[PDB]
Symmetry: C5
Subunit: 203 residues, 5 copies
Amino acid sequence: SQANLMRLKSDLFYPGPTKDDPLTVTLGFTLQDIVKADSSTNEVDLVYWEQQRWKLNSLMWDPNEYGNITDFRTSAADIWTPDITAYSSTRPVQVLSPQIAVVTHDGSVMFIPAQRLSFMCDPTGVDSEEGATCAVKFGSWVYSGFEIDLKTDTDQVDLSSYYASSKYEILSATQTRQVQHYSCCPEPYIDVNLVVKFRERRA
Amino acid sequence: DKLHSQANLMRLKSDLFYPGPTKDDPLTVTLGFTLQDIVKADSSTNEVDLVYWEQQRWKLNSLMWDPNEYGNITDFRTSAADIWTPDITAYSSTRPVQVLSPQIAVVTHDGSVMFIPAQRLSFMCDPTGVDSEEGATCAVKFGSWVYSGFEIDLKTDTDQVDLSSYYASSKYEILSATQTRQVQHYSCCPEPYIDVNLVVKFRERRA
Amino acid sequence: DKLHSQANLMRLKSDLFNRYPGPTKDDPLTVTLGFTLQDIVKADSSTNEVDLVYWEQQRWKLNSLMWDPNEYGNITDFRTSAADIWTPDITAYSSTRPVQVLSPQIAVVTHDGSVMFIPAQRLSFMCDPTGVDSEEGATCAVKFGSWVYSGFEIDLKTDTDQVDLSSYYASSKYEILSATQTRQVQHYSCCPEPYIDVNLVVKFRERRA
Amino acid sequence: DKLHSQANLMRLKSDLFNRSMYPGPTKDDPLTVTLGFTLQDIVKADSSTNEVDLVYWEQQRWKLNSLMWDPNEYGNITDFRTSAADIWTPDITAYSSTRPVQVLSPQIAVVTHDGSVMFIPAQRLSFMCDPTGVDSEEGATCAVKFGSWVYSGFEIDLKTDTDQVDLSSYYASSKYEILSATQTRQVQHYSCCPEPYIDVNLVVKFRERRA
Amino acid sequence: SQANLMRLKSDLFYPGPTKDDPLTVTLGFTLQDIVKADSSTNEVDLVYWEQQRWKLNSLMWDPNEYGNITDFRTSAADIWTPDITAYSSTRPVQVLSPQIAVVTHDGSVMFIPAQRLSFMCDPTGVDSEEGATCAVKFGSWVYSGFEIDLKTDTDQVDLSSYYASSKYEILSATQTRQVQHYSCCPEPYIDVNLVVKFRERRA
Ligand SMILES: c1cncc([C@H]2CC3CCN2CC3)c1
Ligand SMILES: c1cncc([C@H]2CC3CCN2CC3)c1
Ligand SMILES: c1cncc([C@H]2CC3CCN2CC3)c1
Ligand SMILES: c1cncc([C@H]2CC3CCN2CC3)c1
């Protein structure tokens, strides 16, 4: 089986998406913890898992040709991955988990990096019943909507793994598709907007 | 003589130098923690910083060799990047874990591998009660990030965290530290999932 | 047909890369610079340093990067790692920490041989924020230019003297009273040759909550 | 002539590297590393976390047969400098650091024709240390062991030249003054392994310096 | 034009200095800013440009054979560079500028990296009229005086680019060559000693 896997990988190992060969990446966010809210600089720090999924013809294989192998794990540097970027980060994003993706015989890839992000956020009112609200856009930095498209499986941020003893509780968190125009180029870019309303948790 | 033993080790490393575990070729990884120090308990962000040695042990057929065919060499040291290693991860870290020791593993002729990285970890933890008699209790799960229980099974030698190297003058004293294997099931998948749950009860040490 | 389009791109990239030593006095380069100011994160009066987040739009044109779209299936542009190509050494002349890169280091190349590179960056630079809590506010400046190329190898241009503020963080601790980007020419002790820079002048003030 | 010497060094380096290989020490071919510390500064002592930060130079010395050469055979070159990445280096590690060590100096070693290597990285280290009593006459006492992380005493042995830490470069205007600093060899056993491991124990007694 | 430069660089692209082939490095400091003076740890943070110059025969060429090229720019990683090091830094020095050098046809190299350095320094008196005085030595870490010699053009630090609105004003800054011995080796080591007297600037 080891030989089969090796052979498959060898046989497998695409210049990224193009206007003729567009790509749809599905984004989903799991919010694990709001670590810190700095009212002196208006930066908030999030820990979250960013689920990325996409599908490439060039990654399909017949499991029957490879000992019934239906999927495998490989370093994310072994394959192409989307340049999904936070548009209002204030520090470089920190990766908390192993950079390893899962590839299925149907040519779909799933890559779920855990990250810590500092982004621009005014925490004013976090100490009130209404809480504070902040938002950060996630999308390709260099690919327009014509090259890379984004969609979500749902507009509800997954909160099932949120840290129950965090300094902050989540009142709501959504994730929404957006189309933006920027001064630099004619073509529009796509992002998923993460909107979180949150409040200091009482002990 | 000494030149002959070097040649022997070189030939052995050449011959040995695996796509990782699979459902058909599963792997048991043994984890063990040696808790060295609780450096810091931040009640303003609810992060606690631990220093520990994380002992990982696994066994591969593809790393076996007959010692008599290589000058009685029973084991050797090699860079951790020369071999496959488990993607064991803390599930609730708040910053990238920091490695404090050389990334080198010990390989034994039976194919068993021992890898003990030293690490500093910030993880999610409410230190409420740390200043009390009963202390604070926090927990952090360690497991594979991308492998299920059908590819990587985890085991412990014991459920007692090794405290023989715990820093005696730490700001915090350990009341109890346990390491327990956990098997869980999720709706999304049929495969069982495994992790080792590190639970530490600690309080402020009196000077 | 899609496998053909991928092959075409691979062919184009292949031809261009496996075929530029940077600008010279004989073959000088004009780099256009534009700044998009996104946030003034912090102003530290203890050390006289200010931290900004901005997008640094860079454009230049290389004959060596030209291709005929018809010969390549109508590809008019492509994305490529900034490491696969030459990029200008545009540098802040008064930073106090290494610039932090916040965006993927990828450039866009068009068939006419022009490149567009827009790194998002956080920059700490020298700045006395005195008066930032006053009506007139505080003024600060930071020069941007090549570190090693003189005005003879690299010339700088702007498309406008007005910094793009259309993306400035509305709820920042600081608000922008004005922000300009202006071409300048300076001389240094080490070298006779002039160096060219774009001066970023920002007048800012504490935003009333 | 000068070109001749350059060529000679190149030839030598090439003979030693590209065409020689040393897999590290073993039970049959064990290595002895001489360790010495030049303590330069106690930068900070944090009583809230019990961490102390040291700046020091760590003099490492070992000798390999496979690095020996005949100077007469290479234009009388008796030594040379090379990137520490071109040769094997001991995995000498502090056993109680709380953060990754920070390297302050270029990672370049000196190789001598007898096969001896000298490597002296300057480092800043945060390690576990209770600084209670640092404001007393007696001062505070802390210790930290340095040893190979993965080699037992059967593969790597350690020794010092002297038990006296080199204090001739200690920063005279540091916040903290040194009352004594010793470096001592130790043999220890750890639960994971049967084999004993070797360390040099750096023990420092220090005190707040009066202005 | 581009072809000539490419040919030249290819033709050019030395194991470092030796006793039989020593090297003289000229050092010059341009002090731009004293960012911070920390009296709790006795560390001071400097921002400066460190001009390095040296000459290699093996980098010489005839401009006549190369389209009249008299100089070119190249990555500092393409050539040997001197391991000039602050002897009393307390943090890894941080490089603020692109690692690129200028090579001239006579074989002379000029390399001017901007750096931020924390180094050992008691800032006591910095709030007085006479100010505070600190020093830090710069030299090769591993080449003795028999392999690398150092020198300044002048003993006066270039203050022409010093930040006018720094928290600290410069009363004087000098750069002087020194010969020193260390316990580790019999051979002498060469350094250039940066001595700065400074005080808090009145607003
Ligand atoms: C093109 C190339 N590099 C960067 C971009 C930037 C510009 C701007 C920010 C996000 N993205 C599109 C909008 C476009
Ligand atoms: C030459 C080489 N390397 C760096 C430089 C620096 C020094 C000086 C200021 C900015 N820049 C141009 C002149 C020049
Ligand atoms: C064996 C392999 N890798 C690491 C070790 C560790 C365990 C323990 C701490 C330092 N070191 C030797 C003793 C042993
Ligand atoms: C020899 C080899 N490697 C480092 C050194 C150190 C020792 C000491 C400090 C700076 N440098 C020369 C003198 C010498």
